[PDB]
Design brief:
This protein is α+β, with helices and mostly antiparallel strands. The chain folds into two domains: 84 residues, Phosphorylase Kinase, domain 1 (2-Layer Sandwich); 169 residues, Orthogonal Bundle (Transferase(Phosphotransferase), domain 1), CATH 1.10.510. Helix content is 35%, strand content 16%. It contains ten helices and seven strands. The strands form two sheets. Strands 1-2-3-5-4 form a five-stranded antiparallel β-sheet, with helices on one face. A two-stranded antiparallel ribbon has the order 6-7. Helix 4 packs antiparallel against helix 9. The protein starts with 10 loop residues before the first strand and ends in a 10-residue tail after the last helix. The relative contact order is 0.12. This is Proto-oncogene tyrosine-protein kinase Src. Forms a complex with polyoma virus middle T antigen. Interacts with AFAP-110. Interacts with GJA1 and PXN. Belongs to the protein kinase superfamily. Tyr protein kinase family. SRC subfamily.
Length: 260
C-alpha cells in the first residue's frame, strides 16, 4: 500500500478536542509511544477522496514550521494522524490565560515563525487560501506552525474575495491581518464592521489603524501587506527576515509596555 497506512490497532483516541461537519479532532497515542493529533471523517457527510485531499497535500510538504503529517487510514472510517500541538490554535492561545502575559517580543517571534512556514510554502509555489490565527497551531515553547492546508472576508485579499484571484500574494495579505490578531491579543479584525462594510471600505482604500501600543514600523509592515496591487505586496522571505531582525534593525529602542 502507501507508506502512510497504519494498522487501526496502533491508534488510541484519548481526548476529544473538537467536532465539526466532516469529523472529529482528538489527542491520542500512536504505537503507544507517540502522542499525536488525530482527525476523523464521518462517513456520509464527506467524500473519501474529498477529505483525503489535504492529506495527499501534506505528503509532499515537510517543514519545521508546518504541522507534520504522520500517518493515515485511507479506508473508511478515515483517520489522519499529525504531530500534536499542545496549545491549540493561536487564536485560543491569544485570547485565553496565556494572552495576558504575551509581549511584543514574543508576538513578533511567533510572526517570524509563521512567516518562515509560509516562506517554504512560497518556495514550493503553493498557496494556502486561509492563513489566519484560527489556523495556526501553538506547541511547547511558544512554537507556531501553519495548518489546515487543504467567509473569511476580513482575512481575504480583495482580488481573491471578489475575483477568486488566490495567490501567495493574497496569502501575504491575510498575513497582515494575522499581524493585527497578534498585536490585539486575538481580536476580530475591523471591529464593529460587518462583512459588507469591509468589502466596500477596503476597496475605498481603507486600512486598519495602528493597534494600541503597536510600533508604527510594524503597522507600516501591515500596510505593505495590504497594498491593493497584489504584486506590490512583500514576500514571505522578506517578511520572515524583517521580523527575525525586528528588534535590532527596525526597533532597537524597544521598551516594554502595559500590553505590548
Amino acid at each position: 500500500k502507501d507508506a502512510w497506512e497504519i494498522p487501526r490497532e496502533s491508534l488510541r483516541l484519548e481526548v476529544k478536542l473538537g467536532q465539526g461537519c466532516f469529523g472529529e479532532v482528538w489527542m491520542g497515542t500512536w504505537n503507544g509511544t507517540t502522542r499525536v493529533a488525530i482527525k476523523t471523517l464521518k462517513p456520509g457527510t464527506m467524500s473519501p477522496e474529498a477529505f483525503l485531499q489535504e492529506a495527499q497535500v501534506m505528503k509532499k510538504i515537510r517543514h519545521e514550521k508546518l504541522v507534520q503529517l504522520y500517518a493515515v487510514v485511507s479506508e473508511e472510517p478515515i483517520y489522519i494522524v499529525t504531530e500534536y500541538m499542545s496549545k491549540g490554535s493561536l487564536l485560543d492561545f491569544l485570547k485565553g490565560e496565556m494572552g495576558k502575559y504575551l509581549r511584543l517580543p514574543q508576538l513578533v517571534d511567533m510572526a517570524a515563525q509563521i512567516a518562515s512556514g509560509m516562506a517554504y510554502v512560497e518556495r514550493m509555489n503553493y498557496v494556502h487560501r486561509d492563513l489566519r490565527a484560527a489556523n495556526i497551531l501553538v506547541g511547547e515553547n511558544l512554537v507556531c506552525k501553519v495548518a489546515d492546508f487543504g467567509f473569511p472576508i476580513k482575512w481575504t485579499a480583495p482580488e481573491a474575495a471578489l475575483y477568486g484571484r488566490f495567490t501567495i500574494k493574497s496569502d501575504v495579505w491575510s498575513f497582515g491581518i494575522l499581524l493585527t490578531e497578534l498585536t490585539t491579543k486575538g481580536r476580530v479584525p475591523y471591529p464593529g464592521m460587518v462583512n459588507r462594510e469591509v468589502l466596500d471600505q477596503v476597496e475605498r482604500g481603507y486600512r486598519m489603524p495602528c493597534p494600541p501600543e503597536c510600533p508604527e514600523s510594524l503597522h507600516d509592515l501591515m500596510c505593505q501587506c495590504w497594498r491593493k496591487d497584489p504584486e506590490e505586496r512583500p514576500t514571505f522571505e522578506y517578511l520572515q527576515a524583517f521580523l527575525e531582525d525586528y528588534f535590532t534593525s527596525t526597533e532597537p529602542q524597544y521598551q516594554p509596555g502595559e500590553n505590548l
